[PDB]
Design a protein around this ligand. Structure first.
Ligand SMILES: [Fe+3]
Ligand SMILES: [Fe+3]
Ligand SMILES: [Fe+3]
Ligand SMILES: [Fe+3]
Ligand SMILES: [Fe+3]
Ligand SMILES: [Fe+3]
Ligand SMILES: [Fe+3]
Ligand SMILES: [Fe+3]
Ligand SMILES: [Fe+3]
Lengths: 157, 158, 157, 159, 158
C-alpha cells in the first residue's frame, strides 16, 4: 500500500526534522546564540515525540514500521547568520506539512477514517508551527538590519 | 435513508456488543476466572455507554432512533477455554470497527461532516480496543501452553 | 586529531544506540511484549540524552561537531524471540563501552584532562548498563525454557 | 567460669563467620543474576554482624574479655551450582548458629550465670524464627525449581 | 618537588584572578556599567572560593602552602571600553585553565590519583567558564557596533 509506505516515510520525516533542528541548535550554540539554540533543542525533542506518536499508532493499527536511516543534516554547511538558519527551519516545516498532507490524501483515497482522524491534530499543529517560525523569521530579518540589534534580543532568554 | 438506518444499526451493534461482553463475564465467572470476568464486565458497561452516546447524538441531530431487540449472545455455548472467549471478543471488536467504518462511508457519501466528526474518536478508540484485545489474546495463547500458568494471568494481573 | 574525530563518532554511536533501542521497542510492541517495549523506549530516550550531553560538552569545549547519518537499525529483521532482542541490546551496550574506552584512550594520550573527567560518569554508567542488560538476558533465557513463562516477566516486571 | 568466658568469646566469632557466609551467598546470587536472593542474603549478613556487635557490647559491660579471632574464609561457595545448594548451606549455618547458642546457654546454666542466660533468651527465640524462615524458603525453592525457569519468578517477584 | 610548587602556584593564580576580577568591577563601576561590575564582583568572590578550596585540600594532604603576594593588577591602566575588559578576562580564564592542566600533568607524572581526582571538577568548571566568558565577549563585540546598544546588555542581563 501507498498508505503503508507513506506512513513509514512520515516517521522518517519526523526524525529527520528532529536532527535538522539539532543541527540548528549546534550552529547557534557554536555562534553564541544560546537562546535560539535552546529553542531549536526544544523543537528537536518535540519533533522526535511526533515521530514516536506515529510509531505508536502504527504499532496499534498493525502498520509495519521499518526504521530508515536518518540522513545527515546538510544545510548547516551553508548557514552564516541566524537568518539563514530560520529560513531553512521554515522550509523544513513547510516540507513536514506537505508530507502530512500527502499522507492524508492517501488515507482519504483509501477511505482510512482512523488514519485521517489521527492526523487531524498534526494538521492543526503544522498551521501553528509554520506561523510561529514565520513570525520569528520576520522578526529576525527586521532586527538584523541594525548591527548588534539581533543579539540584544536572543538575550530573551 | 441509508445513513439513517446505519446510525440506528450502530446503536444496536453497541448494545449487542455490551451483551456479548456480559456473556463473556458469565463464562469466566462460572469457570472461576474472576479477573477476566471483571475485565469483561467493565467492557460491557463501556460498550453500553458508547451506545448511549450514539443515542444522544441522534436525538440532538433529529436522527430517528427505534430501539431494536438486543440479540442473545451465541458464542458462550461453544467456549471451552479462555482462549476461545478472547478470540470471540476480538472478532466482536473487529465487527464493531467494520460497522463504524461503514457508517463513516455513508456519512462521507452524504457530505455529513457532523456525523463524520462525531465518529472520529470512535474510530481511534477502536484502534486501541482491537490492539488491547489482540495483545491479551496473544498472552493467553502463549501462557496456556503450560498447564495452570494462565491461571496466574488472572489472579496476579487483571 | 583522532580525539576530535572519535568525539564526533561517540555522538553518532549514542544516536545509533537510541535508534536500535527504538527498533527493539517496536519489535516488542508488535509482538505484544508491552513491558519490554516500554523498557526499550525509555532506554532509547536516555541514549539520546547521552548523545545530547556529548554535543553540549563539545560545543562548550570548541570540539566541532558535524552530525552524521543515523543508520537504519539492522538486527530487527532477524529477531524471532525476546532472547534475540536482548542479546542484540547487550552487544550494543558492549560496543557502546568499547567506543567510550577508545575515546578515553585518545584523551589520555592527548593529556586531555577535561575530556577524561567528562567521561568518568559515562564509564561508570556503562558498567551499570551492561550489568543490568546481562541480568535481564539471563532471566529471559532461563524463563523461556518453559512455554508461556516468559510472558510472566513482561506482565509483572 | 573459664568455659563460659571462652565460649562467649567464640560466639562473637561464630556471628561474624555467619555474616561472612551470608555475604558469600549474596555474591554467588549476584554473580548469577538472582538480585532478589542476593539482597536478602546481604541484609542477613548485616544482621548477623549486629548480633556479634551485641555480644561484644554485653561482654565489655560484664567484663568478659573479648579477643577478636580470624573470621574464616567462606568455602561452601566453591560447590554451589544452584540456588537450592545456597539455601541448604544457609539452613545448615543457622542450625549450627542455634547449637552454638544452646551450648553457651548450657555453660551459663552450669555456672549459675543468670545474666548471661537472660541476655541469650531473645537470641534463642530469634534462631527459632530464623531456622523456620530459611527452611520455608528452601522448601519453596526446592518445589519451584522442578520446572525450568519458574524459580526466576520467586526472585523477581518476592525478595 | 614540582607537584608541590605547581599546587602553590595554583592558589596564587586563583587569588590573582580574584584581584583581576575585582579590578574589572572597579573599571566598570567607575564607567557606570553597574551590571557588568556586579558580575565581575561575583566572579572575584568565586575565584577566591576556589583558592580557598585548594588551600583546604592542601592542608588535608600535607601539601605545604605558603601564600604569595597578590600582584597589583595592571590591565586596568589600559582598558578603554567594555570589550577590552572582557578580552582581558577571557585571557585570564585561559591562563587559569592552563595552570590547572600543568598541575594535572604534574600529578599524572607522580601518579598522584588524589590530586587528579580533586582537580576533575575544576577542569570541567573551566570549560564552562571559558565558554561563558567567550559568549559574553561575542555579545559585547556585536552589540558595540551600534552606539549605545551595549548599554542594553548592562541593564537587561546581569
Ligand atoms: Fe513534526
Ligand atoms: Fe515540524
Ligand atoms: Fe463500541
Ligand atoms: Fe549510551
Ligand atoms: Fe545505554
Ligand atoms: Fe546470629
Ligand atoms: Fe544466625
Ligand atoms: Fe578559578
Ligand atoms: Fe576562572
Amino acid at each position: 500500500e501507498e498508505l503503508l509506505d507513506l506512513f513509514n516515510r512520515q516517521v522518517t520525516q519526523e526524525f529527520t526534522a528532529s536532527q535538522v533542528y539539532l543541527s540548528a541548535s549546534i550552529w547557534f550554540d557554536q555562534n553564541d546564540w544560546e537562546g535560539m539554540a535552546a529553542y531549536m533543542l526544544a523543537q528537536s525533542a518535540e519533533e522526535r515525540e511526533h515521530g514516536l506518536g506515529f510509531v505508536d499508532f502504527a504499532n496499534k493499527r498493525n502498520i509495519p514500521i521499518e526504521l530508515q536511516a536518518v540522513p545527515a543534516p546538510v544545510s548547516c554547511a551553508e548557514w552564516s547568520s541566524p537568518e539563514d538558519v530560520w529560513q531553512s527551519i521554515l522550509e523544513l516545516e513547510q516540507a513536514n506539512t506537505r508530507s502530512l498532507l500527502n499522507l492524508a490524501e492517501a488515507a482519504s483515497t483509501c477511505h482510512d477514517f482512523a488514519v485521517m482522524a489521527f492526523l487531524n491534530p498534526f494538521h492543526l499543529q503544522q498551521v501553528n508551527e509554520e506561523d510561529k517560525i514565520g513570525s520569528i523569521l520576520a522578526k529576525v530579518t527586521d532586527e538584523n538590519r541594525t548591527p548588534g540589534l539581533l543579539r540584544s534580543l536572543d538575550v530573551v532568554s
